[PDB]
Design a protein around this ligand. Structure first.
Ligand SMILES: Cc1cc(C)n(-c2ncc(Cl)c(Nc3ccc(Cl)cc3)n2)n1
Ligand SMILES: Cc1cc(C)n(-c2ncc(Cl)c(Nc3ccc(Cl)cc3)n2)n1
Lengths: 119, 122
């Protein structure tokens, strides 16, 4: 038996845990801005976080600092996407979202941004 | 803002969380049922079950690394439900239906309980 709403229900509940700061186990720092999250959700969405949270050096760190070129607004848009399946874009931030998704190794998001930029 | 909906995203997240469970990556709790051990992610358990949600939101129990389920709970019934939590697939059959329904009632998974009731009535 297949429950079509199950995965979206799980994601909705994970986003509720994030909003309530329940079992968040990492702070992602982007140009001093802090983002509280679940390492499992981050690894499930990003090639970069899969690498970081399996990394012998970084796996137990409670704080991860992204490279200094990374845009905090771009990161916030992508973190919201990870937990909701909804990507919120504007003409003024789409390039920063694309650059962030490239860094986070989120190819389908990169491709979606790229196609919208060309359109 | 322009809003793009990724309709397969939620399913891809769940698939990847199940892959982490399979490889025992970031698992932070062992659920013990009649001494049978089940490794899982607390957040996934909370997202699927009223019982787990109440256990890990409770600050006294939030950091427990082992949770023992009530003695009346069948490990096979729990295994079916744990697989459902991580896959959206519920493997119901005549031989396990009573045990699966009883476990879903205990775990407070009312949608699954309803599905079990429909299976018995069919
Ligand atoms: C066979 C298989 C294929 C994938 C993508 N797996 C997998 N399993 C678990 C996780 Cl958390 C995860 N995350 C993740 C996401 C984005 C990127 Cl580019 C890389 C890896 N990916 N497994
Ligand atoms: C306002 C609100 C509504 C829900 C369903 N919330 C919620 N948020 C987060 C989680 Cl993890 C969670 N799990 C969960 C699942 C099964 C059962 Cl019976 C009870 C609660 N439930 N919050």
């Amino acid at each position: 038996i297949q429950f079509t709403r199950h995965a979206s229900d799980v994601l909705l509940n994970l986003n509720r845990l994030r909003s309530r700061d329940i079992l968040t186990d990492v702070v992602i720092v982007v140009s001093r801005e802090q983002f509280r999250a679940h390492k499992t959700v981050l690894m499930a969405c990003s090639g970069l976080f899969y690498s970081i949270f399996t990394d012998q050096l970084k796996r137990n760190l409670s704080v991860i600092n992204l490279d200094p070129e990374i845009n905090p607004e771009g990161f916030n848009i992508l973190l919201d996407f990870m937990y909701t399946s909804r990507l919120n874009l504007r003409e003024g931030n789409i390039m920063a979202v694309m650059a962030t998704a490239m860094y986070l190794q989120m190819e389908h998001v990169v491709d979606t941004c790229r196609k919208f930029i060309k359109a």
